[PDB]
Every structure is written in structure tokens, then in C-alpha cells.
Amino acid sequence: SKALISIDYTYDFVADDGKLTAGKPAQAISKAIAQVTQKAYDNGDYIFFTIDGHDEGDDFHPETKLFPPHNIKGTSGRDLYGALADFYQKHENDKRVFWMDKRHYSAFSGTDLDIRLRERRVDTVVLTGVLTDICVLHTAIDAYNLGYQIEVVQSAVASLSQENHQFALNHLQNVLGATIIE
Amino acid sequence: SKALISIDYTYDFVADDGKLTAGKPAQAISKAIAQVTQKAYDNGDYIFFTIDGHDEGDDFHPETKLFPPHNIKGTSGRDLYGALADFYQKHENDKRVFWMDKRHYSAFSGTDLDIRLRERRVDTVVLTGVLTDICVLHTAIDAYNLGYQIEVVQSAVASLSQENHQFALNHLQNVLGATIIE
Amino acid sequence: SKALISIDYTYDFVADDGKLTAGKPAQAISKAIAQVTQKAYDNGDYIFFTIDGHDEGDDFHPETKLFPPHNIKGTSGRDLYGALADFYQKHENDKRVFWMDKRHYSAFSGTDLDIRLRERRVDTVVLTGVLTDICVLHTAIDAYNLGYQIEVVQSAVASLSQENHQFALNHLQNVLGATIIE
Amino acid sequence: SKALISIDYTYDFVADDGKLTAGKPAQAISKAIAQVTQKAYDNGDYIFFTIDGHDEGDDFHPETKLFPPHNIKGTSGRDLYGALADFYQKHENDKRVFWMDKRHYSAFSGTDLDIRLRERRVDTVVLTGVLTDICVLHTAIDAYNLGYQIEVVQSAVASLSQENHQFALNHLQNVLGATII
Ligand SMILES: [Zn+2]
Ligand SMILES: [Zn+2]
Ligand SMILES: [Zn+2]
Ligand SMILES: [Zn+2]
């Protein structure tokens, strides 16, 4: 059917003292992203938490030259932010809810996301999380190239700047043919 | 060695009468993209022309909902614009120069670009062509996910608007770690 | 949606004078492979001819060291063998019939086969052609990893090595879970 | 730059009591596979343990119709067999030693193996583990399609029969251009 992808909504990307935080704009979607995730689950959708994870002793990651350390495996920075954490805790062992560690921006890159979606004959991915113009955008581009229909929940994605958030939404709708949802 | 990728610099994307033309901004790079391509070749680089091609009777293409017909196989719209066309004519049988038809925005999607690059142990791709924020950007994202170093020649890429061009260059540099060459 | 994959059933792989011919065992399937292809087409299936296309000099292709030149681009060696040639000629412009050049053994590698199948929401591939233990096997393994259901038409696949043919059929059924249609 | 791939050498695939065991033929390479892994690591190679792992009750897995439950995550069935287990324990935290869960036969499918190899500019993979004609073979075919040179250590891979072991070795050498070591 459909799969909701919950991209990088962690303490380090959202919290005031997060190591790579997008801050207020990211915090602003905390209630919405939790609500839409529960709704998707209620609707029978599959839910995939696709979460940046960096190993401590890893000097071969391109990001190391680009950003300070963040989302370190084994640390609290990788905790989900807001009520979304309660959803995951409550449904940790549900067959329809998945946690996938990732190391690139796209949720598809180096993961088994496409495999799990194909097993379930999912034709549509619904994207939520941060940042609209980076991990959301890269995930959508890979989804497009893999032939998925794409929906993006506008009230449940966010970027550092409104300008970049807007560029990303326009690209998603007008280049990738995604449906932007409330 | 390096490979220069020449992305979609065709009549339909560049020329005044092109079916999906980016117009003056695309035309403005015509001399530079030809020069940089010849230089790369003189310097020992492989050259890959990666060009949008639509089969006439193809209603399963995702772009059908978005754009009017363009770059139709067998038509003059797929002709290379400017002096670039003479470079290709002269090297049509050169084992170091390639023409690859593509159907998605990224030059890697559904093509054998990665295979040809890996055969040659290419570690760096040099991106040129149009549009900076779409086919160039998608190609760069795939390249990043595939572990290539990325250079982008600022004078030999163009977008529909300066704003989009700038979003893309910033993303290439700050998100993908690409070297912007001026 | 179903798709029938017609793998390398060409003069060089089948004919008495073919450059890498499997010989009588491959010729033995000529009527069957034509009939099953026509039937699949009559049933509404998509038909994909996935055909080795090589360059003589190519020291960058690992395969060049392993086998004599075969299926060279521009040569009669790439002609389809038997009545399959008439089928292709008659449907050369049919939206449901495709010709795809390939350079590796698998029909998926470096091609846009997965993309075309996903556009059509194909869930099952029907494999025919040669050789059972090389191109058919590699194509099947890729199809399995990409989440396709797989059928193999026993009367329409062949190898030179009958030992290897049986190994392949056993592997297809017992490892990949393919349906061997007999 | 070389990487040794250690494919599926677990209790469930190897031990007498393993849930999907290949039994004696797999047990036979226990000393050789541990030894060669240690040597590769000594030569400066990267070491990747690529290990079948099934989520409990996962009915969407294609193997569900093919094989009995095996290599269940969180169970002792996924323990490495023989001295190889001591290697992993001792080198768990070593930057050059990796553990990757996989669900298809190939070590590349749905994993980040290609990404990690590319980061390190590895051009050659050295294949060990079981079974020669299934997980080893599929990994090799993926490696070939991804442009890697391939070596296969004959004394540290094994199949259910010599016939299949030999089919796979011949395929690796003659079809994929692998070097048999
Ligand atoms: Zn990160
Ligand atoms: Zn187009
Ligand atoms: Zn061939
Ligand atoms: Zn298994």
C-alpha cells in the first residue's frame, strides 16, 4: 500500500542543544509529525524511521569534512524528538514499524528500504521529517528514480530556512511530480 | 583519470525555438561549455554526453504529466547546441567519448554510466550542462551516493533563474562537498 | 502485469556458425521460445529483448579476456535466431515490445530494465533464452534481489553444458523460488 | 586496497545442530577460514562479516516459503562458528572490521557494502564463507557487476556437494574472471 518515511527527526537535528540542529523551524513541526505518523499507522501504512547514524571511529565518511559530529551511534542525540519517540517506543515490535540506520542523506542509499517496500508492493511513499531540502529532497529523488509515487506532508517537513524549504517543495511538486499534502 | 559529463545541452533545452528551452541563460554558456569540454579532453579526461531521450509513443514516462514533448528520439531537438556539436561530430568514434541516452534527470539512472566509470577507475566527475538545479543536481547527488569526487564548472552550467542556479551551487558545495570551478 | 524477458537468443549464441554458440541444445528451443513469446504477447504481456552488444577492441570490459568476440555491434551475429526474428520485426514499433542492448550477463545490469518494469507495475518476469547458467541465471538473481516473482519456461531456455543447465534450473527453483514451467 | 568478505559462517549454517546447517562440509573449513581471515587482516585488509539475519516472524521474506526459520536476530544461531568467532570478538572495535546484517544471499543486496568499499577505494574483494554456489556465488556476481576484481579462497569456502562447489568455482573463474586462491 503506502509507506510513511520518517526522516532524521532526532534530538541532534531538532533540539535547542542538538549537535547539528535546525532549531525552531524543525521544532515547530513536532506535534504535526507525530500526528501524521499515527494517522498513517491507523490507515494501515508501513512506517519507516530512517535515521542518520555515525560510528565513532569513522574517518572515511564524506560528511566528516562538512559538518561537526552528530547523531553518533549509542548517544542520546539519535533519540527521536517529541511525541514521535513515544510512537516508536509503543510500536517498536510491530511488524509494520521499522527502524533503519543510514549514513547518506537519502533514506535509500546503502539501506534495504527499497527491498522492504517492494516486498510489500508499496507504490507510494509519504515523506516527513527534516531537512526539506537535504534528506527529504535526496530521499524523494531516489524514490522518483525507483518509480515510486511521492507525497510530502508540508506541515511535517522543515528546513533551516523558509527559502530552502520553499525551493524544495517546488522541486518536489514540479520536477518530481510529488503531491504536496497539507 | 577524470570524466567530464555533458548533461542535456541540446536544442530543446537551450535554443530559442527549443521545446523545453531554458532560453538566454542556457545559451550564455555555449562558448564556455564547448571550451571546457575540449580542454578536459586535451587533458586526458573521458567525455560522456548524457542526453534526455523520449521514445515517441511512450505514455509511461513520469514527465508526461509535467512537461510538453521534448528531446524526442529521431528529432533535431536532441542535437547538441553550439560548438559542443562539432566536438561530438569529430569524436563520434573516439573510444574516450561516449553518447548515452537517458530518461530520468540523473545521468546515472537506468544508464551504464557508473559501469563505464568504474571500468576506467575514474574517481572524479566534472559536471557541465543544464539545468544546474535539476539534471546537474540529480547527477551530482547520484555521484555523491556512489562515492565519486565531484567538480562543477560554474561557467559551464546554467539554470532558468539565477536564484535556482545559486541554490544548486550552494547545495553542491556545502552538502555534497563538490569543488566549484570558476 | 507480466513481462517476458528474451535473453540473448541470437545467431552468435545459437547458430551452427555462431561465434560463441551453444549449438544443438540452443537450436532445439527455437520453435518453443518463439511460441511462448507470441503467447505472452497475445496474453497482454510486455516483451523485452535483452541482447548482448559488444565492441571488439574493448580492454576495459573484463569479459574481453574471457570469451572470443561475440554479438559485436553492427554484425549479423546479433540477429535473433528462428521465428523470434519475425516476431521482433513485426513488432518493431509496438509500445509493448522493447529492444535493450546490454554489456553484462544480467539483463538488468547497466540497463533501464527495472525502470521500465516498475513504470508498468510488473510484478513477475518470465525468463527465456540462453544460456541457462549464465545470462538467464544472472538475470534471475538480479530479479530476485529486486523483488520480482520469477517464472522460467523450461522448454525455452538452454545451455551448452547440460550439467550446468540442470544446476541452473535447480538453483532457480530451490534458491530463488522461481516457478519452473514444464 | 583489498577487502575480505566473510559470508554467513554462523552456527545455524554450520553446526551439527544448526537450523539450516550444511553440516560436515561447512565444518571442514573452520580452521582455514579463521586462519585466512587473520592473515588478510595482517596484510592490512578490511574485513567484512556479512551475515544472514532474520527478524522474528518476518513473513514478507522470500525465503519464508523455501527454508525453515534460521539465523533469527537475537539468537545464538547467528554466532560465528569456530575460531572465526574469537577473531570477531577480539576485533569488534577495530576500524577495519565490520559486521553487516543481510537478508538476501548476496552481501551487497540491501546493505552498504559497496559504499564502504568505495570509501576506501577497494578494488578487490576476497570471498570466504558458505555456500560456494549460493551466497558466495551471488556476492561474486554482484561484485562483478559493480566492477570489483574478485579472489576466492578455495580452502575457505564450501558447498553441500563437490559438484556444486566446483560448478561455482568454475563459474567464478571462467565467467567472472575471479582468481581462485
Ligand atoms: Zn550525518
Ligand atoms: Zn525529458
Ligand atoms: Zn557477452
Ligand atoms: Zn536466510
Numbering used by the authors:
A (entry chain C), B (entry chain B), C (entry chain A): 2 to 183
D (entry chain D): 2 to 182
Question: What did the study's authors say about this model?
Answer:
Both datasets were collected on SR facilities at the wavelength of 1.000 Å, the high-energy end from the K absorption edge of As (∼ 1.04 Å), and sufficient anomalous signals for SAD phasing were obtained.
SmPncA consists of 183 residues with only one cysteine, Cys136, serving as the potential target for cacodylate modification. Since there was a classical zinc-finger fold structure found in the final model, we identified the other four anomalous scatterers as zinc atoms and further confirmed the existence of zinc atoms in the protein by Inductively Coupled Plasma Atomic Emission Spectrometry ICP-AES (data not shown). However, the peak heights of As are almost twice as those of Zn in the resolution range shown, indicating the phasing power of As was dominating during structure determination. By contrast, zinc atom alone could not provide enough anomalous phasing power to generate a reasonable density map for further model building. Besides, the phase error plot clearly shows that the arsenic scatterers made the major contribution to SAD phasing in this case. In SmPncA, the stark difference in anomalous contributions between As and Zn in phasing power is mainly due to the difference in heavy-atom incorporation manners, although the f'' of As and Zn are slightly different (at 1.000 Å wavelength, f'' (As) is 3.7e and f'' (Zn) is 2.7e). Cysteines were in contact with dimethylarsinoyl, an As (V) group. Here we propose a plausible three-stage cysteine modification mechanism for SmPncA without DTT, involving the Cys136 as a nucleophile to attack at arsenic in the cacodylate, and Asp9 as general acid to donate a proton.
